[PDB]
Amino acid sequence: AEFKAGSAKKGATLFKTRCLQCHTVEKGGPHKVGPNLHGIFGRHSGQAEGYSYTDANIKKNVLWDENNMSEYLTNPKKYIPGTKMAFGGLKKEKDRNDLITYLKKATE
Ligand code: HEC
C-alpha cells in the first residue's frame, strides 16, 4: 500500500519508456511537453521554474512525496482533475515503487 524502495535500474528503464517523452530530470534540463522534474520532491506542485502549469495543477498544491507521487502516477487525471498531463498511469505497484526510487535520486 505504502511506498517501498525498489530497483532504480528498472525505474530508469520505466522513465525512458513512460516519462522521458514529456520530461527531463537534470538541473537546468529543458522543459518538453511537461516540466523538468529536478527538485520535485519536497516541493509544492506547479513550481518548476520556466514552465506554465494549468490551474488544476497549481490549485492542487500538493507537497510532493513518494506516497502521493505513487497515488498521482496510478491515475494522474483522477488525482488532479483538469490536468493536461496526457498519461493514463502506472497501474502496477512494483513499477511505481521502482520508478519513484529512480526519480528520488535522479531529481536530487
Ligand atoms: C506526456 C506525454 C507526459 C508523459 C508521458 C508524462 N508526463 Fe508528467 N506531466 C506532463 C505534463 C504536461 C505535466 C503538466 C500538467 C499540468 O497540469 O500542468 C506533467 C506533470 C507532471 C508532474 C507534476 C510536476 C509538478 O511540478 O507539479 C509530475 C510529478 C510528473 N508529470 C511526473 C511524470 C512521471 C513520473 C511520468 C512517467 C512515469 C510522467 N510524468 C509522464 C506530461 C507527461
Swiss-Prot record:
Major subcellular location class: mitochondrion
Cellular localisation: Mitochondrion intermembrane space
Free-text cofactor note: Binds 1 heme c group covalently per subunit.
Keywords (A to Z) from UniProt: Electron transport, Heme, Iron, Metal-binding, Methylation, Mitochondrion, Respiratory chain, Transport
Induction: By oxygen at the level of transcription. Expression drops rapidly when the oxygen concentration falls below 0.5 uM O(2).
GO cellular component entries: mitochondrial intermembrane space; mitochondrion
Names of required cofactors: heme c
Gene Ontology molecular function, alphabetical: cardiolipin binding; electron transfer activity; heme binding; metal ion binding
Residue list for modification N6,N6,N6-trimethyllysine: K77, K78
Consequence of changing K77R: Loss of methylation by CTM1
Record: residues binding heme c: C19, C22, H23, M85
Post-translational modification: Methylation may enhance its transport into mitochondria. Methylation occurs in fungi, plants, and some protozoa, but not in animals. The precise role of methylation at Lys-78 is unknown, but it seems to preclude pro-apoptotic activity, possibly by lowering affinity for APAF1.
Misc remark: Present with 7330 molecules/cell in log phase SD medium.
Sequence similarity: Belongs to the cytochrome c family.
Name of this protein: Cytochrome c isoform 1
